[PDB]
Amino acid sequence: VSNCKFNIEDYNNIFKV
Amino acid sequence: KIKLALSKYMAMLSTLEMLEIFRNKADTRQIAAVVFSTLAFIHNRFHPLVTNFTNKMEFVVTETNDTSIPLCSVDRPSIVKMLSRNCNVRIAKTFGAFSITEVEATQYLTLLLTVEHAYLHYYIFKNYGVFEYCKSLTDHSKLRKTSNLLLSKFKFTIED
Amino acid sequence: TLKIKLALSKYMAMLSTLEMLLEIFRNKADTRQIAAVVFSTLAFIHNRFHPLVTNFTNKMEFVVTETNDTSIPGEPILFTENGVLLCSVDRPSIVKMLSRCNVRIAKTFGAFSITEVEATQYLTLLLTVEHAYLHYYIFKNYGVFEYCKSLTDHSLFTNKLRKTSNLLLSKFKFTIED
Amino acid sequence: VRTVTEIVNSDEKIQKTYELAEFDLKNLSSLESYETLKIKLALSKYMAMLSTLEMTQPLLEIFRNKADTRQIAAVVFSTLAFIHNRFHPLVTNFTNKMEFVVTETNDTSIPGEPILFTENEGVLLCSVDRPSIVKMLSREFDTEALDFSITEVEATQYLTLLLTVEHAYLHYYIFKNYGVFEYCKSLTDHSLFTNKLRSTMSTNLLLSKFKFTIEDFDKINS
């Protein structure tokens, strides 16, 4: 929606234990 | 012990005595109080030896997507969109002779995951500071206290 | 061979002591007769597989089913215990079951009754009930779950004789090929 | 396929070959009989359900009726939710809110899909073209070619309306699970339902019980 590049790796860091 | 944490938090919520509320825009006091209780509970969990938490911290609610993330601020619209969004034993026994829904469990779990992300961020703000808070926001790169968190119990990945 | 038909003769002598066979199965009302014959056959098979032990459980819960939804493909007899060993007897399926060289040269030089079909009938009945008794033995001497496993995979009791010399299953072999 | 049984002690062997064709025939007969039975059972349950929707007046005029739209909306919800339960046996309840709009003309009757759904930004709306479906059910039927009072023709009517609501429900499922963009391309191309449903439903369908074609279809396309 925000026309924003997404970071798969940042999300993984959010969900990488 | 995971369902133990789930039931403990749900009992604490029932003590608070509360999807419908999230869409209930005007219920700002309720939202602030519940997130306050949740942050205190998470502080209790991650810090079993430190239970005291900020008993009066400011709150605010956002309502527009331009005020949405793709004093505590909350992205009400997105979270509302979310909330609206063994064989052998049983065969052997086949010859041996206030309710909560599963989707509600999913909703509560998503709420908890979002809130624990927000509280991790808040803790970063408090200890490391505001700048390294922004750094954590830009970079989210667990177990070091953290064992008291259900997030470390499951892992989610991505692939193209 | 002689011992084989001797086992059959003893079984049919016991059944004549009961004094009653396919029309009995087809008879749906006489579930009592089906249960009585099943118990007598199971007791006799217990007597055979245990030649020294004549006692067999004489009081068990019985029931005769009539649907293939109460029928296990390949397991006509079911021992489900509800404690009491409730026994299911699928009547239509058993009715279907029952309704289906140099010596010769020397012979060339040499020069109340029953039929062959009835003989195969009674052999099928005795084989079914001895498979039932083997399963019952697994249940009693191993447990309910060991019973169920014996049902799922029959490799458990392929050893047989270790007592099974008097059971007809060990006396004959049949194979299947694609 | 052949099986051999022979005397272990003697070279004598009595080999009997077993023919897979007879077994396949028996399985096919049992399956077709069971399919007939279960479809008849589902249909009977559906007629019982609409009976427990409390309308004495019969379905055909339950549609012909112009003023009566409360019962129209109720029965449409009942059919769509019954289909939902059929594909989702666990589910016995649908969304809290629903709305229905009664289209009654050609300019509001989209061809091929008299029944459709689009949101009003708060809830999804069941567009329904009563004239089209009424004329659909008004057609005389070949109930001849190859103590509640029901008729074979009424059975055709029930099968009809069920298939209509079923296709509308497939489109609605595309809507819900893939956005209006997928909704509209699935409407534009029903071959996409294969891809969408092999993912979800195959993991079946009453219409899959039969294969249907159109006579001379090849030359009609020409």
Side-chain angles (χ1 to χ4, degrees):
Chain A
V1 174
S2 60
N3 192 61
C4 193
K5 290 299 204 300
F6 183 90
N7 190 345
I8 291 167
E9 290 63 45
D10 180 75
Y11 183 99
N12 302 331
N13 312 138
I14 298 170
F15 302 90
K16 181 267 290 181
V17 185
Chain B
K1 289 286 185 175
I2 316 313
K3 292 192 177 185
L4 180 60
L6 181 162
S7 58
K8 285 170 169 170
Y9 181 66
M10 162 76 237
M12 187 74 146
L13 287 182
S14 303
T15 294
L16 309 180
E17 190 275 331
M18 62 295 298
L19 172 50
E20 52 268 5
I21 297 286
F22 306 90
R23 188 269 299 164
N24 186 341
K25 308 167 65 57
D27 206 0
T28 52
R29 284 285 295 186
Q30 188 275 331
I31 296 295
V34 169
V35 65
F36 167 92
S37 302
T38 301
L39 296 166
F41 179 65
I42 297 162
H43 175 75
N44 292 319
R45 287 186 67 85
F46 182 87
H47 298 292
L49 80 172
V50 177
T51 183
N52 48 21
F53 200 75
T54 302
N55 269 324
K56 281 290 171 184
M57 62 80 71
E58 186 56 22
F59 287 100
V60 73
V61 189
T62 79
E63 316 307 350
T64 73
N65 186 34
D66 55 286
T67 61
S68 178
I69 58 184
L71 181 58
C72 174
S73 304
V74 299
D75 172 16
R76 189 273 302 163
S78 184
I79 193 66
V80 170
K81 286 186 296 181
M82 295 300 103
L83 273 298
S84 55
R85 180 190 334 278
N86 49 14
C87 305
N88 212 335
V89 178
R90 54 221 171 201
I91 191 65
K93 64 90 176 179
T94 286
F95 293 99
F98 189 86
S99 181
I100 301 301
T101 63
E102 176 169 12
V103 178
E104 273 185 343
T106 291
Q107 290 184 1
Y108 305 163
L109 172 64
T110 305
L111 282 168
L112 184 61
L113 294 175
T114 306
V115 177
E116 59 76 20
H117 198 50
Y119 179 87
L120 172 151
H121 288 294
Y122 162 92
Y123 175 92
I124 299 294
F125 180 102
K126 297 297 297 303
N127 300 258
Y128 299 84
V130 187
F131 198 106
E132 192 277 331
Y133 179 75
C134 295
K135 296 308 307 185
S136 178
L137 294 165
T138 58
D139 175 15
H140 297 88
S141 303
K142 276 187 175 57
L143 188 153
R144 74 281 191 190
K145 298 178 178 298
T146 300
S147 57
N148 296 274
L149 317 184
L150 316 188
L151 173 54
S152 57
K153 312 294 174 290
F154 74 101
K155 283 75 176 176
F156 171 53
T157 56
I158 297 167
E159 153 176 10
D160 65 350
Chain C
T1 294
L2 265 164
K3 183 64 168 175
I4 313 313
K5 52 164 177 293
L6 175 58
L8 277 299
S9 79
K10 285 184 172 180
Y11 174 60
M12 64 189 72
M14 295 298 102
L15 291 186
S16 296
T17 306
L18 304 177
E19 190 276 331
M20 71 285 278
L21 182 138
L22 174 53
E23 294 298 345
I24 304 179
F25 293 102
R26 170 49 40 182
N27 181 3
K28 315 178 63 53
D30 66 3
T31 59
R32 190 79 181 183
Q33 212 290 343
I34 310 311
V37 172
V38 170
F39 153 63
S40 298
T41 312
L42 289 172
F44 183 65
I45 301 155
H46 181 98
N47 293 320
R48 290 207 59 73
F49 178 82
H50 306 285
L52 195 64
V53 176
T54 296
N55 305 333
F56 174 83
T57 301
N58 297 338
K59 293 292 140 195
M60 311 76 78
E61 193 63 56
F62 281 94
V63 59
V64 184
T65 82
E66 316 302 348
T67 63
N68 189 358
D69 188 9
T70 55
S71 191
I72 307 304
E75 278 291 338
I77 307 299
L78 163 56
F79 293 85
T80 185
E81 88 295 336
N82 187 21
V84 67
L85 311 180
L86 172 62
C87 179
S88 167
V89 187
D90 194 26
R91 184 222 58 68
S93 177
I94 185 62
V95 167
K96 295 191 295 170
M97 294 274 182
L98 277 297
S99 62
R100 227 164 304 280
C101 52
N102 303 324
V103 183
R104 166 57 197 127
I105 315 302
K107 289 194 292 293
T108 316
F109 300 165
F112 174 84
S113 180
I114 45 178
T115 67
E116 187 179 19
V117 285
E118 293 173 348
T120 301
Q121 183 178 1
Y122 273 60
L123 173 60
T124 294
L125 166 57
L126 177 51
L127 295 172
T128 295
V129 185
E130 67 182 2
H131 188 85
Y133 169 81
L134 286 173
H135 276 307
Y136 161 91
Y137 165 90
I138 299 299
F139 179 100
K140 299 295 296 305
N141 303 256
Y142 306 76
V144 189
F145 195 84
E146 294 286 2
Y147 180 76
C148 290
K149 290 193 295 183
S150 172
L151 295 169
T152 81
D153 68 322
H154 298 86
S155 53
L156 278 66
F157 61 89
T158 55
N159 48 69
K160 289 190 170 66
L161 283 72
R162 61 99 172 183
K163 293 178 176 294
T164 313
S165 66
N166 284 336
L167 303 193
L168 297 177
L169 214 62
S170 78
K171 323 301 288 187
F172 88 100
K173 285 77 60 170
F174 162 80
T175 64
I176 302 173
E177 178 178 9
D178 76 327
Chain D
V1 165
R2 58 88 173 174
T3 70
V4 184
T5 306
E6 61 86 20
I7 311 181
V8 301
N9 59 42
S10 174
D11 74 328
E12 178 189 354
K13 53 172 65 178
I14 304 179
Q15 166 177 242
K16 175 175 182 63
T17 301
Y18 283 80
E19 196 175 11
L20 304 178
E22 297 288 351
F23 297 95
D24 302 334
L25 183 63
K26 287 180 285 292
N27 283 251
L28 294 174
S29 180
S30 174
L31 276 296
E32 54 80 14
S33 173
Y34 181 76
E35 291 297 340
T36 300
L37 166 55
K38 59 158 287 304
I39 291 295
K40 289 177 171 176
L41 292 169
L43 276 295
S44 179
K45 187 269 183 181
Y46 182 76
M47 282 75 75
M49 183 278 288
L50 54 83
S51 295
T52 46
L53 280 172
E54 293 75 34
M55 80 298 295
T56 303
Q57 52 157 324
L59 73 165
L60 62 84
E61 63 127 325
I62 245 304
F63 308 136
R64 184 57 266 172
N65 51 20
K66 176 70 195 83
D68 178 16
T69 59
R70 273 281 295 182
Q71 182 58 296
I72 290 295
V75 300
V76 175
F77 153 85
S78 288
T79 317
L80 62 84
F82 156 86
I83 296 176
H84 180 117
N85 189 359
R86 181 264 166 265
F87 302 137
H88 309 66
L90 73 165
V91 180
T92 65
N93 189 359
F94 202 71
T95 305
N96 182 311
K97 180 60 180 184
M98 186 59 191
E99 282 293 317
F100 300 69
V101 60
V102 185
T103 71
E104 296 284 342
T105 187
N106 173 27
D107 203 318
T108 63
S109 82
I110 187 73
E113 298 290 0
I115 302 299
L116 281 192
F117 293 88
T118 187
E119 204 195 9
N120 57 17
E121 290 301 348
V123 63
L124 299 176
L125 181 61
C126 189
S127 174
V128 307
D129 188 61
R130 207 177 54 67
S132 178
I133 48 155
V134 169
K135 62 166 175 40
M136 166 65 189
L137 207 64
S138 72
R139 318 194 202 291
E140 309 87 33
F141 294 156
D142 219 339
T143 45
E144 314 78 13
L146 299 181
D147 63 358
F148 204 78
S149 180
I150 305 299
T151 69
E152 183 178 1
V153 174
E154 300 152 25
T156 301
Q157 291 179 312
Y158 312 143
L159 188 153
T160 298
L161 61 84
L162 282 173
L163 294 174
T164 313
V165 181
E166 183 279 345
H167 195 51
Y169 184 88
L170 296 177
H171 288 279
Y172 182 76
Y173 182 76
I174 299 302
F175 183 78
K176 297 298 300 187
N177 304 67
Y178 309 93
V180 192
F181 181 75
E182 277 293 337
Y183 184 63
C184 305
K185 66 177 71 65
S186 64
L187 295 154
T188 297
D189 181 15
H190 301 89
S191 67
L192 311 175
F193 282 99
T194 299
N195 318 319
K196 299 297 202 64
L197 277 296
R198 178 65 65 192
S199 169
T200 61
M201 183 55 194
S202 65
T203 74
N204 300 327
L205 175 58
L206 317 184
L207 196 69
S208 70
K209 157 184 262 190
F210 291 98
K211 68 197 187 294
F212 293 165
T213 184
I214 311 91
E215 73 192 10
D216 191 70
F217 176 48
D218 60 319
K219 189 262 173 185
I220 301 299
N221 294 348
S222 66

